Ligand binder design. Structure first.
Ligand SMILES: Nc1ncnc2c1ncn2[C@@H]1O[C@H](COP(=O)(O)OP(=O)(O)OP(=O)(O)O)[C@@H](O)[C@H]1O
Ligand SMILES: Nc1ncnc2c1ncn2[C@@H]1O[C@H](COP(=O)(O)OP(=O)(O)OP(=O)(O)O)[C@@H](O)[C@H]1O
Ligand SMILES: Nc1ncnc2c1ncn2[C@@H]1O[C@H](COP(=O)(O)OP(=O)(O)OP(=O)(O)O)[C@@H](O)[C@H]1O
Ligand SMILES: Nc1ncnc2c1ncn2[C@@H]1O[C@H](COP(=O)(O)OP(=O)(O)OP(=O)(O)O)[C@@H](O)[C@H]1O
Ligand SMILES: Nc1ncnc2c1ncn2[C@@H]1O[C@H](COP(=O)(O)OP(=O)(O)OP(=O)(O)O)[C@@H](O)[C@H]1O
Ligand SMILES: [Mg+2]
Ligand SMILES: [Mg+2]
Ligand SMILES: [Mg+2]
Ligand SMILES: [Mg+2]
Ligand SMILES: [Mg+2]
Ligand SMILES: [Mg+2]
Ligand SMILES: [Mg+2]
Ligand SMILES: [Mg+2]
Lengths: 506, 74, 62, 491
């Protein structure tokens, strides 16, 4: 690899990419951040993996937290650090002050600590080191001058020793100065900021690598999530554009539509179904999921508008029994509120269920449901996510977008996502004779040829009935069309008088 | 208690003591604190945060003359 | 013990929900806020729902 | 006293409504705020109402203005404090330093003072005590931690004494700390905050009860006025939705219009006349106000666009003579540019005047005239106040609104008062054969049935003359019609 600084891997879902490899060996990385941001876990997680993946003993210095707790807490992610502090792979080095302490002790002890840590590192033969909360040490009676010299000593000596170290720093403001003494930022070789920005009463955490002296890396923020498995990052921008494409074709669950799409949706293709409220989108999606299970393949449905129960009531009324679908273990309905978390999370909940079930199809009813509150870019970037994941995974996607203005919407995007999408399906009302009739249309298909009519469709207990086109109507799209006739009575089946039979017999 | 003539450091070390001793007893304790600006620091003396095991914030956000009471678990 | 962190219930409608069980055991939970936001009542009421629901004596320092 | 918190009403118009009773008896309240918010007045008005209403001796303590002055100024709201000093019902415990002096007298006096306090409390058998500018005391050479103790010593003692208190505190930023040292904050049982907010080079006074230990209250800010009769707080949120409703009817000034609205307007109801500039809203108001002068009834007219004079003119031009309407003290016109004040001061003028003329009808010449230069929310609130007041008072109300765009306007209102008005009379220019003709319409009436046609009308020296609808046209509402000239059924 073309870099001149040797790196070691953190094995932290995401980091090693953003850091183009992992922390520079024989160096100190300052992972700083607000209260509760993720800091100390990173640290612990950093020593952990080294142990359980490279068999590299690690030395963890605690400053504020009690050596007991660090183990007690780290059990949340499912790690028996105890057992490691026990097998001689992880040496927790207490330095926490005492409940009956004096006052004054942070200079000669800073000299003693070096030798300290230097003992355990030589003793346990360690490669990785964590120094959690150095800050607290200066929080006794210090100022900028004495902090840069004192830190420096520690890192300077540490580097000489050959240990790949991580220090943690607290900071009051999320975007302002990196660290408290606004001095740690230049004493370290690397600087890993961790934030947890608020905005819209929700909470968004992000990781950013300001600098990595010696090599390159991904710049700016990247969202991460602390799950039962610890830190989890999304290089939404490291998501290269090299997915696979195939001319394979699958069903839509709606026959006539299939034709309308050159012969059935492409396996590898994103599908968009936009249409004013009450046009039908939800249905089709259900008919898409259904069929996927009627061919014996898995598929998920993430409902953000309707309940799991109701999704079935209206689903059954349209025929297709979801009750069974669930039972045969072929269709899985998630179903939740977009307000019950930030996108980062929602994007991961979805990803998860896509790995504990391995669908071969997926449908997200109302992307626009997720665009609530959130900023366009934030939402657009999330769309690229799901869309991204499903694309490189051969998993057919059908997204649902509901335009905020029925009849008269000059744009079926509203959030402008129609260019990331491969194939769009359009549903819109049509005002014909004091009646709200429906009508579907196939706008685009990147690989197919698809029908160019704006056919009308009707909903029955049976489903989507794709009838005929409003040829003799102008200003269609306008919603309330204009009837201009050159014909209509034209053949097709003239023959007047008695043409029908009735219910008795024909 | 710190409002007698104390500064950040003095106050952090003190919270530590207090909290810790309380940790030993095995006492599930709750500690109330004052602030200065609805979104400003989390505790009067810019330290109380990192020193606690768990932190909670009760906000009475202003806005259009109507106050809105929220609670968060940092 | 040798598992996760055990929690206690505050029986405060909602909070025991938002906190996934409630305050951690044998640990202090900081609750700060501006004048007139909650705190005391949140402390009083945590004590109260203690006695009045599991019979767990309370100590209030003021 | 094993009972809920006990409060003592302040008889300060609006406050006892916001505190849900009034500052908790025997405890300490903290009204703080920047220079020129109310403070000194408040406490003064606090003690006054306490005496001239319940014979409750008052103990006022000054730390800066000389007792002589507190009186002098007080006479501003018609109350000789000197009288109660003579009557021993109020004691202005002077505590202001003199031209000369020394120093190093820290907690030194804060102690001796608590005795001089307790002194008059016992002596004058006090109950309500107020301390103005307490902070102007620690402004000698102290720090936060120092004030917290000099303050708590007091309040504490005071609660012992048992007298109900209020402490004046100053502030520098209208929305920053609650009190100079951000300590007093927590040292109080109740924190009130007077805010004299700027914005648009205009000033709005807003009071708020941040906290009241042991009792519920009113969350949020409230606008308040400072007049000749003390402070006044309109709890525009507090006002309840229990308005009296009758099925009686009233005339609109225009017969043919009374017909349209199926009998007329309901005495108890708000009506809104909307249209582009010129449509003739001011007419309908002029006509609506004479009718109440035919049934010899007092009606008021609030103009915010035309003058005393000009109105008289354009009025005698429509036939109706106002010159007599005034003489017969059955009609009162106001007039004042919207700019001359803010909605807070307005709402009041209205109220006050309605009390000194006992109207039975009323019409405000243009609301948009008043929505001028103010935030929708701020205006939206001003409607509901008058709208509300005119309602639970039985006064039929008619408000004017010039829509921001003639022809095709897609809403009777912009500010969105549509859902706040019962009846909606809609005026709108209509273009026919190259001439700007009118069109009146009863858009909505909650009770009656009203006419559903869009009838054109015209303006002559005899007033409005509603006519026939545009039966033969199309797109009428849009503004620029389109005759149908349908060729019959073509034989
Ligand atoms: N199993 C878990 N699932 C989800 N979140 C978790 C889990 N365990 C811990 N967390 C979260 O991890 C965070 C704990 O932060 P951490 O111990 O990593 O150090 P810190 O935030 O960097 O520093 P400090 O000690 O000052 O809080 C909390 O915000 C908490 O909600
Ligand atoms: N059993 C049924 N019989 C006839 N028509 C039905 C039936 N069920 C639903 N419909 C029709 O289908 C529409 C319901 O919309 P649908 O559930 O397909 O999702 P949508 O229009 O995409 O999104 P949303 O319903 O959330 O607005 C209704 O407008 C209605 O006319
Ligand atoms: N019975 C009640 N019903 C409704 N609201 C109440 C009641 N009692 C108090 N309150 C509200 O709670 C607030 C009182 O605050 P509380 O005593 O709970 O402690 P705090 O706000 O955390 O701290 P502080 O001592 O600075 O007020 C008041 O400002 C008021 O709005
Ligand atoms: N008769 C009056 N009519 C209308 N407004 C008045 C009258 N008298 C006083 N005011 C207004 O009320 C304010 C008086 O405030 P007051 O002296 O009561 O106390 P404060 O502003 O709270 O504190 P401070 O002593 O620092 O001024 C003035 O700023 C003024 O605008
Ligand atoms: N003597 C008159 N004879 C004929 N028409 C008149 C006479 N006086 C007024 N008008 C008509 O009435 C209009 C005057 O407007 P009016 O007094 O009704 O108030 P408005 O339209 O509601 O509001 P604004 O005057 O601010 O535009 C003129 O534009 C004109 O068409
Ligand atoms: Mg923390
Ligand atoms: Mg930590
Ligand atoms: Mg739907
Ligand atoms: Mg409190
Ligand atoms: Mg004063
Ligand atoms: Mg307090
Ligand atoms: Mg006009
Ligand atoms: Mg006018």
């Amino acid at each position: 690899e073309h870099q001149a600084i040797a790196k070691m891997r953190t094995m932290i879902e995401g980091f090693d990419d953003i850091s183009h490899g992992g922390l520079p060996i024989g160096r100190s990385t300052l992972v700083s951040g607000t209260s509760g941001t993720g800091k100390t876990l990173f640290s612990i997680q950093f020593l952990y993996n080294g142990i359980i993946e490279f068999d590299e003993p690690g030395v963890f210095v605690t400053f504020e937290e009690t050596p007991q707790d660090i183990i007690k807490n780290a059990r949340s992610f499912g790690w028996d650090l105890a057992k490691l502090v026990d097998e001689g792979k992880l040496f927790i080095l207490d330095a926490s002050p005492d409940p009956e302490g004096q006052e004054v002790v942070g200079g000669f002890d800073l000299s003693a600590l070096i030798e300290r840590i230097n003992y355990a590192i030589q003793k346990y033969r360690a490669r990785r080191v964590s120094i959690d909360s150095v800050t607290s040490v200066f929080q006794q009676y210090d100022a900028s001058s004495v902090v840069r010299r004192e830190l420096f000593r520690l890192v300077a000596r540490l580097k000489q020793i050959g240990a790949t170290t991580v220090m943690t720093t607290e900071r009051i403001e999320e975007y302002g100065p990196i660290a408290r003494y606004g001095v740690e930022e230049f004493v370290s070789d690397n600087v890993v900021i961790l934030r947890n920005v608020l905005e819209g009463e929700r909470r968004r955490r992000t990781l950013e690598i300001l600098k990595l002296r010696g090599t390159s890396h991904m710049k700016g923020e990247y969202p991460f999530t602390i799950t039962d498995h610890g830190i989890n990052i999304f290089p939404l921008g490291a998501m290269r554009l090299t997915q696979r494409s195939s001319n394979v074709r699958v069903s839509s669950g709606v026959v006539r539509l299939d034709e309308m799409c050159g012969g059935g949706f492409f396996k590898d293709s994103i599908i968009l179904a936009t249409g004013a409220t009450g046009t039908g989108k939800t249905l089709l999606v259900s008919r898409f999921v259904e069929n996927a299970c009627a061919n014996k393949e898995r598929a998920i449905l993430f409902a953000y508008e309707e309940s799991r129960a109701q999704l079935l009531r209206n689903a059954y009324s349209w025929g297709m029994d979801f009750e069974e679908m669930e039972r045969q273990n072929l269709l899985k309905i998630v179903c939740a509120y977009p307000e019950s978390a930030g996108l980062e999370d929602h994007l991961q909940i979805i990803k998860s269920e896509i790995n504990d079930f391995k669908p071969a199809r997926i449908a997200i009813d109302s992307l626009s449901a997720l665009a609530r509150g959130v900023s366009n870019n934030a939402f657009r970037q999330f769309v690229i996510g799901v869309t991204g994941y499903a694309k490189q995974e051969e998993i057919t996607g059908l997204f649902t977008n509901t335009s905020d203005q029925f009849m008269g919407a000059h744009s079926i995007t509203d959030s402008h996502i129609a260019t990331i999408t491969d194939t769009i399906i359009l549903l819109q009302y049509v005002e014909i004779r004091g009646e709200m009739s429906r009508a579907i249309n196939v706008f685009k298909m990147r690989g197919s040829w698809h029908d160019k009519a704006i056919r009308e469709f009707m909903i029955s207990d049976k489903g989507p009935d794709i009838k005929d086109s409003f040829r003799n109507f102008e200003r269609i799209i306008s919603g309330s069309p204009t009837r201009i006739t050159v014909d209509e009575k034209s053949e097709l089946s003239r023959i007047v008088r008695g043409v029908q039979e009735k219910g008795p017999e024909s």
